[PDB]
């Protein structure tokens, strides 16, 4: 994906296809899936005796073949499906029958010895692929953040909540969905988080229109919203409805791919904003606040585009788009003045190992005063504050060193200090291995490492900050005699201020 | 993943950090002078990331006739009790020993001031038969109903001890 148009545009395009410079050689019995749940897709090979994978790293390289530690022989079974059943967010291996399931937990290096889970009571599960008249699939139709088992037929939607480790609860009827009996072809049923929220909506595709049933938080369906196709577009069995966030809007758009003689595509945008976010506040005393949001993925495209234009190779460490706050605006009803803060983000990252978001390494805050018309001749120039934070992923933190305002006649910058606590002394430490190094760096996440304040003036010294602030943090290992991760404590040891007042000297 | 409830699980603190066992367990039956009626294994906990050095204890009875609880010892001597009485617990409505959450129930200051939190359990009211029909239990949810504070008299003990419901 590339930024289409100028930087700051929200438009998205794709570049001319290029061969990837490197691919795995073994592609006869393999597929691309995140097997570890690390955020890195794995080319996973499960061939005639050979089991392992190649992960796709963020810098574009591939790892060498990594053997799996354990794989069920049933991985390749015709009814094998993967699903999040342990609730770990990992894809577990499961086989489903009507009375029991067989579950192999994903241990993120292979799978665990599986277990046969007997369903309690009289709970009978649907079996995927068993009946062409209905759809059996995993989906968050209850809007709870998990993979529930849902069966969609012409007259009703039934769902068995996932209680974990292969256990399912009683079927829940989710009324409101209804198709004309014999016309109900499951091939026409697609599921989606169209409002960007928990519950997954049911989209029924007809030849000339979409019949969309909004999901009322797992309590049944809304009367369908009918959308019509543009003239000349008709849907059929050779066509496909694809859903994806391809705009940087969070909410996936509906793409109709019609491969006929000259393959063409259409996209239906239902929203330009994620619909449940807080938009406005008004205190009825003249203060009005407007929030705006922008997907993190659009900041990435701007970051990427800027790097391309300077010959640099940007790396995104966040494959899981979030909506960040952008362009907060405060309106003074009564004075007529407005104040807008635009945040720009860069270098954010996903932890991978603990499956958590570490945060944005860089946050840049503008500050613009819109004085009431006729008030003043553009007085009070806009300000800019740059803030660099630790992510605790020293592939990013180490790189922030080049983005700082430079002054050669300056004190040495800071690096984090790692210590322990030995006979009550703050003893310097170099981590023994990667597991410790990881946890020591994890402890740094979110700390401000540096900030700079600039005026966005038209002066000859507009690029020189008024102030520069540097910090040095420290992580102390207090108790390693524990479950593998040690107890760490962290704080700021050094804080250095510089006052330039835009004068470099 | 979904908790096993077999002590292989970990817990999150008052801040969503992982708690770890820091101290060897000890046996105790008396809490702030209150004889709880059972011997509890008391396990000390710390956050993996040490926010303000708060210390936590998990009290686990050796008997099936009692439920567990958590205590928090704040750096200022403030002491908190979470999840002791059943209204303070979120637990599997069937296997009720599977407590998912321990909600703050009581708190005592270092100077004798107290707070007691009265929770109300969810129930089958305020709705249509259809709501109940497809969701027969799920009464594990707890809502804060009344927070009682400003004890008329002074006490160094937690107000929730002995399971005594507050009077206004």
């Amino acid at each position: 994906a590339q930024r289409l148009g100028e930087i700051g545009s929200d438009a998205v395009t794709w570049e001319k296809m290029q061969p990837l410079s490197v691919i795995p050689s073994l592609q006869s019995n393999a597929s691309l899936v995140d097997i570890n749940g690390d955020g890195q897709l794995d080319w996973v090979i499960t061939g005639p005796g050979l089991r392992g994978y190649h992960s796709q790293r963020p810098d574009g390289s591939w790892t060498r073949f990594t053997p799996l530690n354990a794989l069920p022989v049933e991985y390749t079974h015709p009814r094998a499906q993967l699903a999040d059943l342990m609730g770990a967010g990992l894809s577990d291996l499961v086989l489903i029958g009507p009375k029991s399931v067989r579950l192999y937990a994903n241990t993120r290096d292979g799978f665990a010895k599986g277990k046969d889970v007997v369903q309690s009571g009289e709970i009978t599960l649907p079996v995927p692929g068993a009946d062409p008249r209905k759809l059996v699939a995993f989906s968050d139709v209850l809007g709870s953040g998990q993979a529930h088992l849902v069966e969609v037929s012409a007259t009703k939607v039934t769902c068995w909540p996932n209680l974990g480790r292969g256990r399912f609860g009683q079927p829940i009827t989710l009324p409101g969905f209804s198709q004309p009996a014999t016309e109900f072809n499951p091939a026409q049923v697609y599921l989606a988080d169209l409002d960007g929220s928990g519950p997954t909506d049911l989209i029924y595709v007809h030849t000339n229109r979409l019949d969309i049933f909004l999901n009322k938080s797992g309590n049944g369906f809304a009367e369908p919203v009918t959308l019509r196709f543009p003239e000349g577009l008709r849907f059929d069995h050779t066509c496909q409805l694809q859903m994806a966030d391809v705009q940087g809007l969070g909410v996936a758009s509906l793409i109709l791919s019609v491969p006929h003689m000259s393959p063409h595509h259409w996209r239906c945008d239902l929203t330009n904003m994620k619909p449940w976010l807080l938009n406005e506040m008004n205190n009825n005393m003249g203060v009005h606040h407007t929030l705006r949001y922008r997907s993190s993925s659009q900041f990435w495209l701007d970051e990427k585009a800027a790097a391309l234009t300077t010959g640099q190779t940007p790396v995104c460490y966040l494959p899981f788009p979030i909506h960040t706050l952008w362009q907060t605006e405060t309106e003074d009803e009564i004075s007529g003045n407005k104040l807008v803060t635009t945040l720009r983000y860069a270098r954010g990252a996903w932890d991978g190992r603990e499956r958590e978001f570490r945060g944005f390494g860089y946050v840049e805050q503008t500050d613009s005063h819109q004085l009431a018309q006729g008030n003043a001749p553009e007085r009070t120039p806009p300000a800019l504050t740059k803030n660099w934070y630790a992510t605790g992923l020293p592939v990013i933190d180490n790189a922030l060193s080049t983005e700082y305002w430079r002054d050669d006649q300056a004190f040495a910058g800071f690096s984090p200090r790692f210590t322990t606590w030995q006979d009550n002394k703050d003893v310097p430490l170099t981590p023994e291995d990667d597991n410790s190094r990881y946890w020591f760096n994890r402890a740094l996440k979110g700390q401000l490492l540096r900030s700079e304040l600039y005026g966005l003036d038209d002066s000859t010294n507009k690029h020189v900050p008024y102030t520069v602030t540097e910090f040095r943090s420290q992580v102390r290992r207090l108790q390693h005699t524990d479950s593998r991760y040690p107890v760490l404590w962290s704080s700021v040891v050094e804080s250095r201020n510089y006052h330039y007042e835009r004068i470099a000297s | 993943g979904v908790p096993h409830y077999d002590e292989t699980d970990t817990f999150l603190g008052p801040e969503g950090e992982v708690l770890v066992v820091a101290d060897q367990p000890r046996d105790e039956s008396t809490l702030q002078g209150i004889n709880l009626g059972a011997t509890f294994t008391v396990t000390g906990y710390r956050s993996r990331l040490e926010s303000h050095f708060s210390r936590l204890e998990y009290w686990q009875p050796k008997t099936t006739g009692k439920t567990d609880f958590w205590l928090i010892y704040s750096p200022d001597g403030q002491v908190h009790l979470l999840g002791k009485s059943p209204q303070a617990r979120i637990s599997n409505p069937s296997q009720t020993t599977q407590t998912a959450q321990w909600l703050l129930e009581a708190s005592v200051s270092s100077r004798g001031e107290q707070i007691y939190y009265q929770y109300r359990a969810e129930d089958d009211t305020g709705c249509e038969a259809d709501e109940i029909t497809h969701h027969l239990q799920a009464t594990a949810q707890r809502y804060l109903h009344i927070v009682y504070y400003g004890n008329r008299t002074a006490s160094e003990t937690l107000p929730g001890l002995d399971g005594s419901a507050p009077s206004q």
Partner: peptide
């Protein structure tokens, strides 16, 4: 204080 969980969607291939 506060809390956050980042929710991502994982898609199986079968």
């Amino acid at each position: 204080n506060d809390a956050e969980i980042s929710f991502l969607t994982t898609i199986p291939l079968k």
